[PDB]
Design a protein around this nucleic acid. Structure first.
Lengths: 56, 121, 233, 251
RNA sequence: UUACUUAUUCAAUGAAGCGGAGCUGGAAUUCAUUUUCCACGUUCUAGCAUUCAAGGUCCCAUUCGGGGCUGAUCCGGGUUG
RNA sequence: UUGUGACGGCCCGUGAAAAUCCACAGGAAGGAAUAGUUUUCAUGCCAGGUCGUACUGAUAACCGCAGCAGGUCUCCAAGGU
RNA sequence: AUGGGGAAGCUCCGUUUCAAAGGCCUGAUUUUAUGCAGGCCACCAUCGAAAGGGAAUCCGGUUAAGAUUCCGGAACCUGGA
């Protein structure tokens, strides 16, 4: 129960991974992959826009 | 010169100074005496057969108590009045409308001896 | 140098959280502030009849400063010197039996609205200054007409608070000189010449001239744009 | 006589709407700066059923532009909107289902829903399931978009009035017969206390203009004047014609 | 019939970006002096955007580091319709 | 019989809110060595007030003029047929 | 209730409304304090359930009549140091 959570230690309420006690392993992995992939895509799109402006 | 920078578009009531009361005369001019002293919270014992049983076997003094007295006040009053350490206080408002307190003393004290010191065997 | 990096935040429409801009233009002001500002705005927008805005024609800074310098020379007596004067005259009447003329004749500025109005009526007023800050304008709205009829030099000056500071108060709303000392009668005359040229002899023009009627800057821009695209043929 | 049912319905004692299970007022995003100069991207988190409402609602989360916050707006879900979809709201938004472009920015013949009657009212028109608004034309001078309403009426709205592209989900709901006083009961149990409906002819003359008689009959013409008063306005109010008409949409 | 806005009236927001003016390069009929508009960085993805902001100029006693300017244009204080 | 679990059916009906508690993102701030931090690990110390609490709950403790064949919400629920 | 607006008025509406609407973290912290050039924010009063939501107790014994309340034993929670 919510107040019962106050008497237990921190280990019982979380997992050692990032976003441990908040998000599941698969969702954390999906958002890591998403972050890395679309920041790389942001770099690619920025480079392509700069080079097309140079061409223009 | 320039106007004050207002990064919030809201206006709040400024924190003006709040002085402390400095009366020119006392409100009531005489502090009332203690409205609940030991002699008021501890009115009298209860000397029914059941209460005497609690005294003789349970090491428990049974008192009629001021209806406005709580367990802290009863404990303090019993300690101040009979020079005894108490272990627990239980209270109940009786069907006749008065407060009744079962005060259990520590094992270092004898309720029977304290009762026959008070005057009721 | 190799440890620091160029962040720059992009403040586009959907890019980054906006930084703390000065939003004083958009403050949700209290109602009293809002009523102050809108009272000003409405007085400006409404066509004011000549009797208003024959005020708001105050003197310029330098002539107002020299007028108030002369009047500070003619400042009234404060509580301390007044009480000292009372003690001195009491001692005088006690010892020399002088008929209450031991103390000299005061030379002071005359203040008080109805006192000064009576002074203009009896033509004792050598010069009169009228504030433009009077909360009900009708208290003094007639005063330039009275000064014109009586032929007494009048001016409209900025600050009932300034006049009050002159006559040793918070707010005088009018001041008047009736007597001048010989040492600065010339200064008063040279002041009155310009005061008169600015106010007394322009009385008919200022009584004919209608004031007010200005719009706000957005409305001015609107009529500017409309006029430009109209006369563009 | 007596105060009749339609008169009693305005005091709102037992006739107020049952709003416990509702999911909040479905309103467009506040027209702040981005909605009228560029666009803003929100994300559709969940599409939910709203009690008393045939259309699904969509909860869309936007980023606060002026502070580090998330703002959850409650939208009327358009057909084809799904969870995880990106919604774009603003003048610069693209013509896609679920976007909140202004009428001036959408072209003629566009299907829009949750359209604002005035710019900033956060959605007034075409909000029931399956309903939409057609963009008929533009008047760029004193910008006014002409639209066609779900009833067939032609309206002239400001060109800055927002609206979601597409049609409203839950369409075709009234094609199913209820089949049951039970289904009607459960429908209205969370709309409001307007069902069942007793006929006025089945009442007494104290209770209704139609009540009374030794047969159940209205007695006088059931078409009531627009200038009639409360207690008189029971029947066909300001009817231009009556009877079964063979006709079309005529719009 | 129609114009003004300031009375009155309607609506929204935590009154946040209104009106106008412009660092900037051009798509681009300029008679040698730009009317417009865009450059004033967001659209394949259920990620993340916050610590007077990093950087960049100017300065310091330089001790938990900072202080102006700029980043983040200026003017009008008509919150906006 | 009760509780629980994984499921399946129904709806133009999809079947409260808030207090409260925890967690995560972030990284402000602070921290060495005969001693710092950890009171989300274990142990140890103190206190926990006020009011109700008996009994009936019905063919006699309630309402119906009553110790009235009436009315008045609910939990437990053995064997055989 | 308040702000505000009606009503001759008893009072009516209204509950975030055209309001200048507060409490909450750590330093100041005994030349003077709980001031303040420390900092964070910006809820709409309140009442409303002894069947809704909720911090924590069980067994045995004990009375003429109370007990998950007393006693014996064995625990748990909250708030403090």
């Amino acid at each position: 129960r919510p107040r019962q959570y106050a008497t237990v230690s921190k280990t019982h309420k979380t997992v050692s991974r990032a976003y441990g006690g908040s998000r599941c392993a698969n969702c954390v992995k999906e958002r890591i992959i998403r972050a890395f992939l679309i920041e790389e895509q942001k770099i690619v799109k920025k480079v392509v826009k700069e080079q097309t402006e140079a061409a223009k | 010169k320039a106007l004050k920078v207002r990064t919030s578009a809201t206006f709040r009531l400024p924190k003006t100074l709040k002085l402390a009361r400095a009366p020119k005369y006392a409100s009531k001019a005489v502090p009332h005496y203690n409205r609940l002293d030991s002699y008021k919270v501890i009115e009298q014992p209860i000397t029914s057969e059941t209460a005497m049983k609690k005294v003789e076997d349970g090491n428990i003094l049974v008192f009629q108590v001021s209806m406005k007295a709580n367990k802290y006040q009863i404990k303090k009053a019993v300690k101040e009045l009979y020079e005894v350490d108490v272990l627990k206080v239980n209270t109940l408002v009786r069907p006749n409308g008065t407060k009744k307190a079962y005060v259990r003393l520590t094992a270092d004290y004898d309720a029977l001896d304290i009762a026959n010191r008070i005057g009721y065997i | 140098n190799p440890l620091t990096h160029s962040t720059p935040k992009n403040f586009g429409i959907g890019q980054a959280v906006q930084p703390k801009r000065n939003l004083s233009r958009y403050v949700k002001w209290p109602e009293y502030v809002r009523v102050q500002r809108q009272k000003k705005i409405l007085s400006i927008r409404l066509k004011v009849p000549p009797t208003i805005a024959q005020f708001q024609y105050t003197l310029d800074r330098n002539t107002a400063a020299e007028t108030f310098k002369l009047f500070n020379k003619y400042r009234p007596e404060t509580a301390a010197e007044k009480k000292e004067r009372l003690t001195k005259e009491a001692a005088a009447v006690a010892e020399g039996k002088s008929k209450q003329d031991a103390s000299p004749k005061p030379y002071a500025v005359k203040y008080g609205l109805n006192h000064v109005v009576a002074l203009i009526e009896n033509k004792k007023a050598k010069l009169v200054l009228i504030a433009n800050d009077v909360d009900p304008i009708e208290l003094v709205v007639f005063l330039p007409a009275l000064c014109k009829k009586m032929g007494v030099p009048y001016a409209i000056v900025k600050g009932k608070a300034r006049l009050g500071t002159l006559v040793n108060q918070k707010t005088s709303a009018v001041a008047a000189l009736t007597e001048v000392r010989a040492e600065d009668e010339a200064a008063l005359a040279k002041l009155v010449s310009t005061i008169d040229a600015n106010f007394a002899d322009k009385y008919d023009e200022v009584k004919k001239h209608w004031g007010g009627g200005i719009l706000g800057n957005k409305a001015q821009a609107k009529m500017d744009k409309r006029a430009k695209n109209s006369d563009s043929a | 006589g007596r105060v009749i049912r339609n008169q009693r319905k305005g005091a709102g004692s037992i006739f107020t709407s049952h709003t416990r299970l509702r999911q909040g007022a479905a309103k467009l995003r506040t027209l702040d700066y981005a909605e009228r100069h560029g666009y803003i991207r929100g994300i559709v988190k969940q599409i939910v059923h709203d009690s008393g409402r045939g259309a699904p609602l969509a909860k869309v989360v936007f980023r606060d532009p002026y502070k580090y916050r998330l703002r959850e707006e409650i939208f009327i879900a358009n057909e084809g909107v799904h969870t995880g979809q990106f919604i774009y709201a603003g003048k610069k938004a693209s013509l896609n289902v679920g976007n909140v472009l202004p009428l001036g920015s959408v072209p003629e013949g566009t299907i829009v829903s949750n359209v604002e009657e005035k710019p900033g009212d956060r959605g007034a028109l075409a909000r029931a399931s399956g309903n939409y608004v057609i963009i008929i034309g533009h008047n760029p001078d004193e910008n006014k978009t002409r639209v066609r309403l779900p009833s067939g009426a032609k309206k002239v709205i400001s060109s800055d009035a927002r609206g979601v592209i597409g049609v409203i989900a839950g369409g075709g709901r009234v094609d199913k017969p209820l089949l049951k006083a039970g289904r009607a009961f459960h429908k209205y149990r969370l709309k409001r206390n307007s069902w069942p409906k007793t006929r006025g002819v089945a009442m007494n003359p104290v209770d209704h203009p139609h009540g009374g008689g030794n047969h159940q009959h209205i007695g006088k013409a059931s078409t009531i004047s627009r200038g009639a008063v409360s207690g008189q306005k029971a029947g066909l109010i300001a009817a231009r014609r009556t009877g079964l008409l063979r006709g079309s949409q005529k719009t």
